[PDB]
């Protein structure tokens, strides 16, 4: 019950998609070939969330892989755990988008997007009672940003009472990947803020600081990279699938994290993470989790989260630990750092507890904070984006696929207002 | 469902045409005989259903001498017998002959063949054109080949590796005339083209390969090397891919400005390659070395517009990401105001195949860059001066009037360069 | 072709009493048997029918098997050796052949005539939203 | 449950052969290749004779 | 249990039947001696009980030399000794001589042999008459022969292969007269006759076969392949079979128009045969290519009434409709309004057998096309005028009038041309 359907969009998400199913696959104990060999009775209590049933007792994930190019799709199966995906849900194009949004949102995406339109209804319907949708995409790519946004747009148009979530990778100016990153990313969010229920921001740069500061691994790689979120994605749904002291459903978290309709950009992180050489050394207890959860470097976005304040944030403590200790330290933090916390919303952190830890660790926590810091991300994205447009640089392309300068004009405005409407509460006082 | 069909027009292309295949052939387990002694060769060669792999290339040249070399050479069995269309009278460096008299009755044959090639490959990505501008034939037939294509099918993306005359070294005496007229045809029909001046290679030839007596045979091989890098991601596996359709969408700030000059590294022969660690950080900088440029320029005289450089080998995202970190700060490389981020990064795992009988010393890492900078105007403005010198007294103008061209054609062409020359100045002014 | 398929209706009719009348377990034990019994339901079909880094493959061509072909034309002496052919004159050796391969395979892409669009008629049923029990 | 084991295998056992059937064509396409490989070799030299 | 009888005369019959019989013997494994080295053979041979096998054919001709070559050649033992009815004096291209003067003394012998030959057979479907039209050699005998066969037998179908004279290349100088009279005889007596003017092959041969010096021996071979393709459905197993009687019910729109023109493909030499997949997809289009038309006529200049084109080999039936659908969409290609569908598709398995020492190169797949297109009027129009030019002042007419011909025959024959042309024009107009 209260299950979800995973929909991936874009090459970036596919790489995340594989490990998340790969990482999620281990937790329950589902072997690569599709033959269950779990040990615990608890490991199968709520298997319905991420596994169906068909002939032979095998299990297939409820995922639809959608991309406009085959290259990522071909490689995605050949790896481990790839045989879980059902062959009949894959949808793929034959032209490509070339990192140009217009080709992937008005010309090519719409035509092929019906198929992904067809399948998604199938997967969602089958379950007993749908719990919501989650979508991952890379705003830095032209193809996903258009097709991915459109699928989100239709989904809200088709199922009003469900909830949609988004793990977003927003380009950080320090590390560049696409010459058109300022163009597309700023444009795409314009539709994102309107309909998407929740958007999680994670920066590639932060991914790299954790490896070269705390994890202390010599040669990081996407597999090291993509793993980080996958465990992070593991925590977000960890409490939903197992027992707990105070079960926290997907909306449960939403209930305490959105002060206002237009402020729906939270930022999360995973911990603890200790150097392999030292792991034998750090003290493992309930308190220690807090040092690395509010830590500057452990939180996975480019903006320093100490330059503003926290409007609202809560952590989903997972594992067996005394419930008094979890609360006491929580109010413990909210007392002697008041400057960083607003004053007209008291006791501004929520608590959650689950009794089953991932394999290999005793206690860990997953954090999702709505910190005012996010103002910086748009400014730099805005700052560069505003600059490029005045000269009409690289404007002929998007004008060549039915688009106009007017569409470019409006979206720039929405970001400026959106950023403004977020910083206001920073100076708000009662 | 991804490939590339090659069109070569002109003697320089044919000689360069051979060079590319030897580099291509050995990287995919194909012997000279064309008989094989999973599906990774689909992009270049089309399976016959039983037996040989067929090169997807077309060779055009109006003179039989060079072609006579191919059909009895070591690669005799390889190419299809009825795709090497040839003429009977050489244009004799007269651009007019290749555009009004002899080219007309051979253009059809090339047009007929091309449609067949698109009939087999399913998802043709674009057309690659390699031609010598400074020749009556290569400039002529190569020029017309673009005219029909731009209208024959439509919005297919095209690439062209031209060969402009050197600043102080040249072969013929008519290169300044025909080259300028050539520019007009190529300005409004191809998305991308790369400067390939001959002089630079020799200078690159002198230091690196440590061969004081290089020959065009050595010259050709390196160019074919670039071909491997630009199209490398099509047929291999990597941690991050790049495609042809995604190049001319990210390396062209404006539709008109479409001249970017390449630079390749490293070049260290096996005689001494084993005294430097070939670290990624050092190689990354080595590409941007001003003098090393594959082209006729000192980008120190201008800004940069867009640098989409592709790595290959055992490269790592950190080895590159930090490398680009150091490059941005330097004083000697300045970016235009309205592109704060100006790189596109790729990754391809295949080690760079080393041809036998060549000079390149195999290394575990490599980098090839294609960046379009404002400094390109030097050749255009520089080449203008020679064109101005001769046309003033109408020297050599007498024969081009003899091949059926109207005199007015010459006058119109020059205006295009200035407008192109003027535009370069305009976009370069900071806001 | 399993005999277990032809079991037709009217055969489920009374088939004696599977348990004997003398070995009936008392209520106490039955309260403890639920855990074991349920598992068989979930995995019995599961027990019977249900049952990392990139690696390069060997290069297709073996060094010892180049089988170099001779030119069609008959050159007589080294004098007329023309540079236009000196390409491929040297056969590959062990050093030249690359050490590793990373193929791209589309056998899973060269299929799927098109994506599916099912033009059906609903047929999904509505289960009601709360406490399945009031749903018709 | 003891009943469902057999039929659920029924698909499994009935479907392995098709995998062998996919092998049927696997043997199949040797026909042209063996046809083109050798038989044409002689014909190529037949014009030579 | 199914049989067909072969009739030949002079140039066309004799030297097309030679090749067709080598092809048939090679396919069935019947050696030149007639002994079979240790049931499909029935449709073209009759049992001798022990040892050999005599083909069901009757050779007819007036000039002994060509026939005499058959009795002493390497195929001497093959044909029945007394079926080679041989004349004594030649007609000398004179239609009157071969139709009223000397043909009478041979028709009696020719028919009786036909009677006896038909006696043994039990499943007579039709007669394959390969006769010469422009060759006064046999036209006169040919015209009368069909006439007698009609009244003698009746509803039994008849098939004839006429080789009309090329629009520009011709051998005789009196050909325009002889053909026009012959057309009159065939008009109301034949059911299916195909245009096979020699001109196309001369263009076809140098286009594909790669023999810059073609000859008659080259010419004959191609015709033989066509007949095998047409008949193989009858004598070998087929998923969707078509028999001889199932042509005139499917290609003759009206009793008057009973002429069709054929074409064959692929044609390619082994020297370059297998650089391509020869996919069934491409072969279908080529068959409709105007440049390969088996007759010197342009289908682009006329509509299409019906095309019953036959496959042979291992063509996957599904691809058959996969390839056809594309044909209809394409676009002086179009079918008349009153023809919703004019395609008869049949598939036969057995691959064509290729004779050693020939030019054709075997392949796993092949197709032979038989489509009737309105452009047929062109051959009649050009010949119709030519008759006018000579007859304007009775050139050579005296010789024909001197052999018993009535001077009024020519006028009525001419009236035949206009009727056919007018009927074609009326049927080619839309509603
Ligand atoms: N004393 C005590 N109170 C508990 C315990 N667990 C939950 N509560 C009470 O439950 C309140 C919060 O609500 P929950 O029990 O988590 O469940 P709920 O009220 O239905 O809220 P949701 O189900 O999340 O919508 C807390 O304020 C506690 O007072 C417990 O173990 N001991
Ligand atoms: N780098 C290099 N350039 C070559 C080589 N061969 C020919 N070229 C180029 O070709 C030019 C010589 O004239 P071409 O354009 O090749 O003559 P063509 O191709 O036969 O065309 P036409 O002169 O019109 O007949 C030189 O200026 C070179 O730029 C070569 O081996 N290496
Ligand atoms: N295809 C083919 N043509 C032939 C043959 N023998 C002669 N021809 C030529 O083909 C032309 C027309 O062919 P036919 O219909 O046979 O005319 P014909 O019966 O040969 O008339 P004659 O020339 O008097 O023999 C004649 O003018 C001959 O020159 C042959 O065996 N095959
Ligand atoms: N998290 C993550 N992001 C990546 C990875 N590789 C590339 N990216 C980001 O994804 C963007 C390109 O997205 P892409 O894969 O092309 O999506 P597409 O446009 O649908 O093909 C780049 O700007 C990168 O910053 C990866 O391994 N992990
Ligand atoms: Mg509760
Ligand atoms: Mg030349
Ligand atoms: Mg004769």
């Amino acid at each position: 019950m209260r299950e979800i359907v995973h929909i991936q969009g874009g090459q970036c998400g596919n790489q995340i998609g594989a490990k998340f199913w790969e990482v999620i696959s281990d937790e329950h104990g589902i072997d690569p070939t599709g033959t269950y060999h779990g040990d615990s009775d608890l490991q199968l209590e709520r298997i319905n969330v991420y596994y169906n049933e068909a002939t032979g007792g095998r299990y297939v994930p409820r995922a639809i892989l959608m991309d406009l190019e085959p290259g990522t799709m071909d490689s995605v199966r050949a790896g481990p755990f790839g045989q879980l995906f059902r062959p009949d849900n894959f949808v793929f194009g034959q032209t490509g988008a070339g990192n140009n949004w217009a080709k992937g949102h008005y010309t090519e995406g719409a035509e092929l997007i019906d198929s992904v339109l067809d399948v998604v209804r199938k997967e969602a319907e089958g379950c007993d009672c749908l719990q919501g949708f989650q979508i991952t995409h890379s705003l830095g790519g032209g193809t996903g940003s258009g097709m991915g946004t459109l699928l989100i747009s239709k989904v809200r148009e088709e199922y009003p009472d469900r909830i949609m979530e988004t793990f977003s990778v927003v380009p950080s100016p320090k590390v560049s990947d696409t010459v058109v990153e300022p163009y597309n990313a700023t444009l795409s969010v314009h539709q994102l803020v309107e309909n998407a229920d929740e958007c999680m921001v994670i920066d590639n740069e932060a991914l790299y600081d954790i490896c070269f500061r705390t994890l202390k691994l010599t040669t990081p790689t996407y597999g090291d990279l993509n793993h980080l979120v996958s465990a992070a994605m593991s925590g977000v749904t960890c409490c939903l699938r197992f027992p707990g002291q105070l079960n926290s459903d997907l909306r449960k978290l939403a209930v305490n994290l959105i002060p206002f309709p237009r402020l729906h950009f939270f930022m999360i992180g995973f911990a603890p993470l200790t150097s392999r050489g030292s792991q034998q050394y750090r003290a493992l207890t309930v308190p220690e989790l807090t040092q690395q959860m509010f830590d500057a470097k452990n939180m996975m976005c480019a903006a320093d989260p100490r330059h503003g304040r926290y409007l609202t944030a809560s952590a989903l403590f997972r594992g067996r630990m005394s419930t008094k200790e979890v609360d006491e330290q929580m109010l413990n933090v909210q007392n002697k750092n008041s400057s960083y916390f607003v004053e007209w919303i008291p006791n501004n952190i929520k608590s959650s507890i689950c009794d089953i830890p991932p394999k290999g660790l005793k206690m860990a926590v997953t954090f999702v904070g709505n910190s005012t810091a996010i103002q910086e991300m748009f400014k730099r994205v805005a700052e560069q984006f505003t600059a490029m447009f005045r000269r009409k640089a690289f404007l002929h392309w998007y004008t060549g696929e039915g688009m106009d300068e007017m569409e470019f004009t409006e979206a720039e405005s929405n970001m400026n207002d959106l950023v403004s409407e977020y910083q206001q509460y920073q100076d708000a006082t009662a | 469902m991804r490939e590339v069909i090659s069109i070569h027009v002109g003697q320089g292309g044919i000689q360069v045409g051979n060079a590319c295949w030897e580099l291509f052939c050995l990287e995919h387990g194909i012997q000279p005989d064309g008989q094989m002694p999973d599906d990774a060769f689909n992009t270049f060669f089309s399976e016959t259903g039983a037996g040989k792999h067929v090169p997807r290339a077309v060779f055009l040249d109006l003179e039989p001498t060079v072609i006579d070399e191919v059909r009895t050479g070591t690669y005799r069995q390889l190419f299809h017998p009825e795709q090497l269309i040839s003429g009977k009278e050489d244009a004799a460096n007269n651009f007019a002959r290749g555009h009004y008299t002899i080219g007309k009755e051979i253009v059809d044959l090339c047009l007929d063949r091309i449609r067949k090639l698109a009939d087999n490959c399913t998802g043709l990505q674009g057309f690659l054109v390699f031609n010598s501008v400074g020749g009556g034939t290569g400039s002529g037939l190569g020029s017309l080949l673009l005219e029909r294509l731009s209208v024959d099918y439509g919005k297919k993306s095209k690439l062209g590796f031209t060969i402009y005359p050197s600043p102080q070294v040249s072969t013929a005496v008519v290169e300044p005339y025909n080259s300028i007229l050539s520019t007009h045809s190529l300005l409004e029909h191809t998305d991308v083209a790369v400067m390939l001046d001959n002089e630079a290679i020799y200078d690159i030839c002198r230091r690196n390969l440590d061969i004081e007596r290089p020959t065009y045979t050595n010259l050709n091989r390196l160019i074919a090397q670039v071909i491997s890098s630009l199209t490398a991601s099509l047929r291999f596996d990597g941690a991050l891919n790049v495609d042809i359709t995604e190049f001319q969408t990210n390396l062209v700030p404006y539709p008109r400005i479409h001249f970017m000059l390449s630079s390749y590294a490293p070049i260290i022969s096996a005689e001494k390659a084993y005294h430097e660690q070939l670290s990624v950080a050092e190689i990354t900088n080595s590409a941007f070395e001003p003098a090393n440029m594959m082209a006729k320029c000192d980008p120190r005289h201008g800004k940069y517009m867009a640098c989409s450089m592709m790595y290959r080998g055992d490269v790592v995202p950190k080895d590159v990401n930090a490398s680009i970190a150091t490059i941005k700060t330097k004083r000697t490389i300045q970016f235009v105001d309205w592109c704060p981020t100006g790189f596109k990064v790729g990754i391809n795992y295949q080690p760079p195949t080393v041809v036998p009988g060549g000079d390149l010393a195999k290394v575990m890492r490599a980098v090839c860059m294609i960046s379009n900078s404002t400094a390109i105007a030097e050749v255009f403005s520089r080449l203008d001066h020679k064109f101005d010198l001769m046309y003033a007294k109408r020297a050599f103008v007498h024969w081009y009037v003899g091949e059926g061209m109207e005199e007015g054609e010459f006058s119109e062409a020059r205006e295009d360069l200035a407008a192109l020359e003027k535009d370069y100045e305009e976009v370069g002014i900071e806001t | 072709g399993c005999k277990a398929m032809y079991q037709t209706t009217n055969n489920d009719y009374g088939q004696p009493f599977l348990q004997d009348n003398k070995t009936v377990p008392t209520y106490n034990e039955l309260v403890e048997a639920q855990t074991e019994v349920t598992r068989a339901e979930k995995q019995l079909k599961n027990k019977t029918v249900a049952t990392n880094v990139i690696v390069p493959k060997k290069f297709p061509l073996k060094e010892d098997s180049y089988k170099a072909p001779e030119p069609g034309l008959k050159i007589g002496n080294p004098l007329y050796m023309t540079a236009n052919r000196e390409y491929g004159m040297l056969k590959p050796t062990a050093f030249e052949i690359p050490n590793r391969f990373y193929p791209k395979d589309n056998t899973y892409s060269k299929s799927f005539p098109g994506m599916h669009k099912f033009d059906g008629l609903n047929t999904n049923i509505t289960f009601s939203k709360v406490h399945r029990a009031l749903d018709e | 449950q003891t009943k469902k084991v057999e039929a659920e295998l029924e698909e499994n056992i009935l479907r392995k052969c098709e995998e062998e059937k996919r092998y049927e064509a696997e043997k199949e396409r040797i026909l042209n290749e063996q046809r083109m490989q050798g038989r044409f070799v002689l014909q190529q030299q037949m014009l030579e004779k």
Side-chain angles (χ1 to χ4, degrees), chain B residues 33-144:
Chain B
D33 282 329
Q35 319 277 353
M36 211 285 278
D38 291 357
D39 195 51
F41 63 89
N42 202 279
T43 299
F44 268 115
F45 305 78
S46 179
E47 182 65 26
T48 192
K52 184 178 184 293
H53 304 237
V54 65
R56 204 181 330 301
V58 60
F59 293 176
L60 283 72
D61 195 342
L62 308 170
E63 206 284 335
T65 301
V66 176
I67 301 299
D68 284 322
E69 190 277 331
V70 160
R71 269 185 307 243
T72 51
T74 187
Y75 276 125
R76 187 263 188 187
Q77 297 293 143
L78 182 66
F79 295 86
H80 190 301
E82 75 174 1
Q83 48 181 36
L84 283 72
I85 297 169
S86 179
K88 282 195 177 179
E89 184 62 26
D90 178 19
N93 281 109
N94 169 293
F95 168 84
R97 272 202 72 202
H99 202 227
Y100 278 73
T101 300
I102 65 170
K104 289 184 179 180
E105 304 185 324
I106 301 299
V107 65
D108 276 333
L109 262 58
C110 177
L111 273 296
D112 291 331
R113 175 76 38 198
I114 301 299
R115 180 183 57 79
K116 201 168 315 302
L117 290 174
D119 291 331
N120 185 273
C121 313
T122 181
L124 186 153
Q125 299 302 123
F127 292 86
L128 277 48
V129 298
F130 292 164
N131 59 3
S132 79
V133 64
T137 69
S139 64
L141 277 296
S143 66
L144 195 57

Side-chain angles (χ1 to χ4, degrees), chain A residues 250-402:
Chain A
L250 302 174
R251 274 161 31 61
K252 180 60 66 167
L253 183 63
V255 169
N256 305 167
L257 272 68
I258 298 88
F260 291 96
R262 291 154 83 210
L263 281 76
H264 63 87
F265 283 71
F266 317 139
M267 65 180 288
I268 79 170
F270 180 83
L273 294 174
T274 292
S275 66
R276 194 68 97 169
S278 175
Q279 184 178 4
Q280 298 214 31
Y281 297 117
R282 263 171 73 186
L284 294 174
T285 59
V286 176
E288 294 294 328
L289 285 191
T290 61
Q291 301 281 42
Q292 210 182 335
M293 69 180 182
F294 285 49
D295 209 338
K297 63 179 169 171
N298 202 24
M299 171 170 138
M300 295 299 291
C301 295
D304 191 342
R306 62 170 55 87
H307 298 178
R309 286 182 294 171
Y310 278 95
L311 292 176
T312 188
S314 166
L316 282 85
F317 276 69
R318 59 88 173 173
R320 65 181 294 276
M321 73 291 291
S322 79
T323 61
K324 179 181 150 292
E325 182 160 75
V326 74
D327 302 303
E328 54 187 355
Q329 213 184 310
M330 182 59 47
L331 179 41
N332 189 283
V333 176
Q334 198 48 11
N335 191 342
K336 67 182 290 294
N337 319 297
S338 68
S339 174
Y340 296 96
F341 287 94
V342 290
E343 56 87 20
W344 49 249
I345 177 168
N347 290 318
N348 53 6
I349 307 168
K350 175 178 181 291
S351 295
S352 296
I353 296 88
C354 172
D355 306 314
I356 298 315
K359 200 171 61 86
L361 277 296
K362 287 186 285 299
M363 295 298 102
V365 159
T366 312
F367 175 80
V368 184
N370 198 359
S371 182
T372 61
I374 62 170
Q375 66 148 324
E376 195 68 28
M377 294 182 286
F378 294 136
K379 295 177 72 68
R380 60 196 40 182
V381 170
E383 170 180 15
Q384 65 183 357
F385 173 78
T386 76
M388 261 189 210
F389 189 76
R390 65 178 64 88
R391 280 308 285 297
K392 281 70 177 174
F394 304 90
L395 184 61
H396 65 279
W397 281 91
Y398 291 77
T399 58
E401 316 203 282

Side-chain angles (χ1 to χ4, degrees), chain C residues 39-78:
Chain C
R39 182 187 316 292
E41 297 288 327
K42 294 179 182 317
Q43 297 176 359
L44 188 153
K45 295 173 65 66
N46 216 1
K47 296 297 181 181
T48 74
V49 287
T51 64
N52 60 280
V53 75
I54 204 73
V55 299
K57 309 142 179 294
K58 314 322 301 170
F59 180 105
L61 264 50
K62 185 71 173 66
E63 165 49 37
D64 272 316
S65 66
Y66 188 53
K67 300 289 94 176
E70 287 182 354
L73 178 145
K74 187 171 161 324
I75 306 156
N77 262 332

Side-chain angles (χ1 to χ4, degrees), chain B residues 133-352:
Chain B
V133 64
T137 69
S139 64
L141 277 296
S143 66
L144 195 57
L145 281 178
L146 291 175
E147 182 65 26
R148 296 295 86 193
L149 262 58
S150 195
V151 64
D152 282 329
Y153 303 161
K155 63 180 73 67
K156 300 295 184 182
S157 55
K158 290 177 290 322
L159 282 81
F161 284 2
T162 62
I163 301 299
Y164 280 127
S166 296
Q168 66 264 22
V169 166
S170 170
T171 300
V173 72
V174 67
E175 70 277 17
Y177 283 165
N178 59 6
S179 66
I180 301 303
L181 277 296
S182 66
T183 300
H184 162 80
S185 183
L186 188 151
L187 292 173
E188 313 323 298
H189 284 355
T190 307
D191 291 331
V192 172
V194 176
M195 295 298 102
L196 284 169
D197 58 349
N198 282 347
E199 196 193 357
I201 301 169
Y202 284 170
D203 300 330
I204 306 299
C205 288
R206 204 81 161 211
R207 64 190 60 191
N208 297 115
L209 294 188
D210 197 357
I211 301 299
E212 293 179 351
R213 186 161 328 259
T215 293
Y216 292 166
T217 296
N218 296 115
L219 277 296
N220 297 311
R221 263 161 143 159
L222 291 203
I223 301 299
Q225 188 67 33
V226 176
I227 321 305
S228 181
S229 290
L230 204 169
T231 48
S233 85
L234 294 174
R235 41 206 155 82
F236 290 166
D237 188 358
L240 188 60
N241 314 71
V242 63
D243 307 334
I244 297 89
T245 297
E246 307 179 7
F247 282 100
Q248 57 89 25
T249 67
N250 296 295
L251 294 174
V252 188
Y254 297 97
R256 299 293 72 54
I257 190 167
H258 58 68
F259 294 71
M260 73 291 291
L261 73 165
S262 76
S263 47
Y264 188 71
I267 294 189
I268 62 170
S269 54
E271 288 298 329
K272 65 178 72 66
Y274 296 132
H275 292 355
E276 62 189 3
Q277 65 182 357
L278 274 300
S279 177
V280 55
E282 65 183 1
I283 77 166
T284 299
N285 182 348
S286 302
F288 275 14
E289 281 189 59
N292 174 320
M293 202 59 79
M294 186 66 203
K296 218 179 262 202
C297 182
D298 186 74
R300 289 177 290 212
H301 269 182
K303 300 295 289 184
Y304 275 94
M305 294 182 286
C307 181
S308 164
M309 65 180 288
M310 295 298 102
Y311 296 64
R312 42 189 301 182
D314 52 30
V315 67
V316 182
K318 213 52 61 173
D319 273 313
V320 293
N321 188 349
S323 295
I324 301 299
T326 187
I327 193 66
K328 220 179 299 171
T329 300
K330 288 266 198 283
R331 290 86 170 176
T332 194
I333 297 169
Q334 51 210 309
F335 284 50
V336 176
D337 186 74
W338 38 251
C339 165
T341 61
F343 298 83
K344 193 275 181 185
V345 63
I347 297 169
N348 188 328
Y349 281 114
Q350 203 94 230

Side-chain angles (χ1 to χ4, degrees), chain A residues 35 41 56 74 87 90 118 125, chain C residues 39 49-50 108-109 115 118 124:
Chain A
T35 305
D41 297 332
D74 291 331
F90 278 96
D118 185 325
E125 195 284 318
Chain C
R39 182 187 316 292
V49 287
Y108 203 100
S109 287
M115 295 299 102
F118 85 106
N124 289 327

